[PDB]
Design a protein around this nucleic acid. Structure first.
Lengths: 226, 227, 226, 227, 227, 226
DNA sequence: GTTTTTAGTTTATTG
DNA sequence: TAATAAACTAAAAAC
DNA sequence: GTTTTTAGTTTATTG
DNA sequence: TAATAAACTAAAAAC
DNA sequence: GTTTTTAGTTTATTG
DNA sequence: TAATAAACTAAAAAC
């Protein structure tokens, strides 16, 4: 439970230093390679296929899997050139309505809170964002990696906190084609009514606490065995 | 156009056949390590820290690394002990309005491809879901792994496609334990309106197409330059 | 052994693939024609009477006799007008108690089969039918033709199997208006007692094993000796 | 409206007169063909293939094709050998409980009818059959052909008349070989009860009045238009 | 010349069809009254004693005469009251050994005519009755009249047919007592043998050919001579 | 009840004068045609067809109606000439076995009683016939009318008496010509057993006292009413 | 290729 | 004597 | 084109 | 002296 | 100075 | 089969 990195968002003149904190962390139990004879850890290493010898990662240059399979040498100049990656401060670009954004845009989120002991400006920003209902957007960066992001505030039982989302690039989504789907189909009003009552009978409330990972429960039992 | 997964919605007796296709593809291209000296691709191998000797991935066991350092190879029966492990069909549990589910749980997303023979049933299901406007929370199986997910109706105009979103586990969202905001804060209505005036002056609607990634453009330029 | 068609029950959401099969095949020896003198198989070719010569089957035109025998001019378009042909799935309409159905219209029979690996809904529907003990009336379709048919289950001991029986149209059945049986009838107890005695004397159980198509067996001996 | 047959039930001494009737006459319009360009009704003609010449029907030789299709010479006397064709009385073999027979063996139905002289015996036999509620497996005969058949009573609203339906030879019925269905299947309670509720929702009584052959009505109206 | 009566046996439900033919007819030549003087046959016209007037068949009413001498007109409606009187078919009540019924009660004989289409039941009834050899006592109704009768199997060298014999009512037979034979009679064995030897000496089997109507023969000869 | 006549039975030299008593008499109610309005008996006179005039029996000469219809005159001399009819006694002609005589042959009977006060001969003949069972046949005559007859022994409930039978002439029996039944037939042993068992079920004891003339019983009851 | 089902003829039987 | 059932081909469809 | 009831003769022998 | 129990007759309907 | 937490690969299996 | 599980490693800031 430690901050990933510092954050300074420059909203006009008034900049709020905000510290980010991970909102999630894998529930699954993480294992590592253990040879039965060894009963010890196993680690990979960069072994050159043409050379046939172990090499260090620094010597090796990352290459994209080109269709031609030709050689590529990663150069830090490309990434270093961009100023967004260098800028450790948070960047505010626009506010967009919550209804405008759809489920897809959300990928990952983290909490947000102000570094300074004065949570005033943060409180006003969160409250005005809630009133306007225009989720703010940020070209967020981390470890010299920029990425579009969005802001939202949620009221927990004890308190309310503003927080961020990891926003996928809209170009990335690939709309599908289902030629069979577009074929015309008719619906029977009686069949419609039957479907409605069936779903209502199956319909119920929301029970997040009831949902559980049977696989993770088995993992918990296994670790109890260990 | 690549069918990642196939099956059928095993909801009760509905068993509407469906094919699953990955909804979104990452713009970035996976990288394979290469050494400028070697002038070719590179493939790693595995050596222990106590063997000091290369051991193929097959002989290595999947054992947890506990704090005590004890490591026990994972039992295969326990791996497959889940009754739903075999499943090759998406299974439904419940239905609920969308507002009930919290967006944070959303992790990944796939599209659902129906079949002509059952096209009537799928279309009717989509219509009833749209009318009731009530999301559906459904178990999910994929390459011998279970994952919790929900599905909803999405419209591409006259084309409307049902889709599934992988949902993060309930316990995954960790609450914040923060004293910094536990201190009481007072808000001035004058400053509230002063901030809101700008908040609404610079406000604009969603423009997903307008935004572009400079990093991907630089990557494409590098790819062109190297070939 | 071969399938007739391959459709899928269509009851609202329920869509369980089915591979219908021919319940009963007529094993009676079918008897070809051969010219006695030529000893060659015969072939039917059609000579139009008023024409005076043969006519191709496609050219042959279809007409109607209205009791008076007068012909009628017809076109394929009107036949195509009806939409029943498009039905290539077994639409379901309504269920009925097994007792209600009458045993004089079970014209022909057809089994069902599971095609998709998802047999679960199949067996679930079969068990629901068996428990409720209500037949299902299904608008069976076949070869651009529709025959109102019953849907029912008959546990074969080894494994429950769902069956569909093609039902004669209720309009087809005729309720004979006999003028004789209405006449008043009187019976004394002695004759009824005698009838019960004789019936119980002849009473026994169905014996499928002891039943053989004597004619078919003898003609099979014939066919063998030749 | 005309009888198809006459005879008597040759069981024991009962020998009640019977006037068999056609249970179900197919009202569906059978649709003759006439050559269009001339408007002349077409007649077939039997022609020898090698000869390419018409042949009398009697001169035709009935033949059978072996598993390889090879012909088989066959003579009338051999068919005449079997005597059961002669029997012109509906003998009786046994009486069986009504529920014993499956609802799939019998396809075609046939009514029965007495002659004024001995209507009393007919009615008494019908009443005894109704009371005992056990069918009669009658070794029906017809048109030099013998067909196993069942005998029961279907009391009409006003009168009770015994009926006979031709019964498929239990040899003809084919059992199913369903290796796929042999696969073990599983069921859960909630889905089962939901499906039962749905079925009960669909529950309803037989409605012969509302049931019609849409195609027959439409085509009949069409021909009415033509005339 | 034709059948006297027709109708199927009404045995329970057995109801074997049959028709009745007069077994025997008088051999004597029937005579018709005539007057030699006027060369004309004679009709009979009936009148009362007080009327002295011609009264036709219709205007003549039936009546009964009592010992007191009073007269009661017969009511035709009550005559046919009993259900059996309206029967148009022979009916059987019970069976009995042949010897049980006395030979005294035998008025008339009749033959039975089988039915071609149902002759099997008729023949089988004949055979079973012959095997058991138990003459069946059966009611009998014809010409609006009722009579007792029994049916017996009689076999001709080439034919075997049941035959119904009119049975005299038991009430008709009467047994007046005679004191003449009430006197005790004693006959010695010597006289017994003396009589029996002659009795067996002149005794011979039936000679039906020898027995014949001599008077009818003479009358027929005279008639032929006149004709 | 009085003897019809006193016919003496002649055999060799020993003759037993024996009276004849009617062994039967119809119990039907007696009816005389009576005019309703008159309520008196009805008598008929015999009227000439051509003459239209009443003719008495004495004036009437009997003749037979041949197919021509012409008179066939008959004289009483021919009937009177027969010695048998003149005789007022009964003469035995042959002794025939009782099993020999068929139930057809006799159609009416009359009790036979001894006229002589000494019934020695009568009882002796009765015993001889009973032991020998050689039915005594006689050319019996009544009213100058001769008919073949047989004389039988019956043991009454107290004693044993002799009665005569009216034997129809052997020519009278008409052998039927029924070619239909001459056609052959097969019998099923199972059906044979069923028929035999049915007969046994219906088989019972002789019940002469039961059989009552329901028609004549109704007539008697009506007379009792009137 | 293959079976199976459907649409009409003929052809013959029963009354 | 026309209604009806039985044998049959051809043809068309579904797989 | 019958063949069997049936009242009324008609008789004939009987207590 | 009167009775009545059996043949002849046609009347009449039935089939 | 040490840790965790995450992005980047980077294999490796599987519909 | 490329997507996805499983794991290695870079770095990265946090106290």
């Amino acid at each position: 439970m430690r901050a990933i990195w510092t954050g300074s968002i420059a909203f006009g003149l008034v900049n709020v230093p905000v510290k980010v904190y991970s909102a999630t962390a894998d529930h699954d139990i993480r294992f590592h390679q253990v040879h039965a004879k060894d009963n010890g850890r196993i680690r990979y290493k960069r072994v050159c296929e043409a050379c046939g010898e172990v090499v260090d990662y620094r010597d090796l240059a990352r290459a994209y899997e080109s269709g031609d399979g030709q050689m590529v040498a990663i150069t830090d100049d490309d990434i270093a050139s961009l100023p967004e990656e260098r800028s450790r401060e948070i960047e505010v670009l626009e506010f967009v309505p919550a209804a405008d954004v759809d489920p897809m845009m959300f990928d990952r989120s983290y909490f947000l809170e102000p570094d300074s002991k004065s949570s005033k400006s943060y409180v006003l920003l969160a409250k005005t964002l809630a009133e306007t209902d225009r989720m703010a957007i940020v070209h967020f960066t981390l470890r010299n990696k920029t990425r579009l992001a969005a802001l939202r505030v949620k009221d927990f039982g004890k308190r309310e906190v503003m927080m961020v989302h990891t926003l996928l690039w809209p170009d990335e989504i690939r709309d599908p084609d289902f030629p069979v789907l577009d074929q015309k189909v008719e619906i029977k009003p009686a069949e419609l009514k039957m479907a409605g009552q069936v779903v209502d009978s199956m319909a119920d409330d929301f029970n997040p606490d009831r949902y559980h990972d049977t696989y993770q429960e088995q993992l918990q039992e296994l670790i109890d065995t260990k």
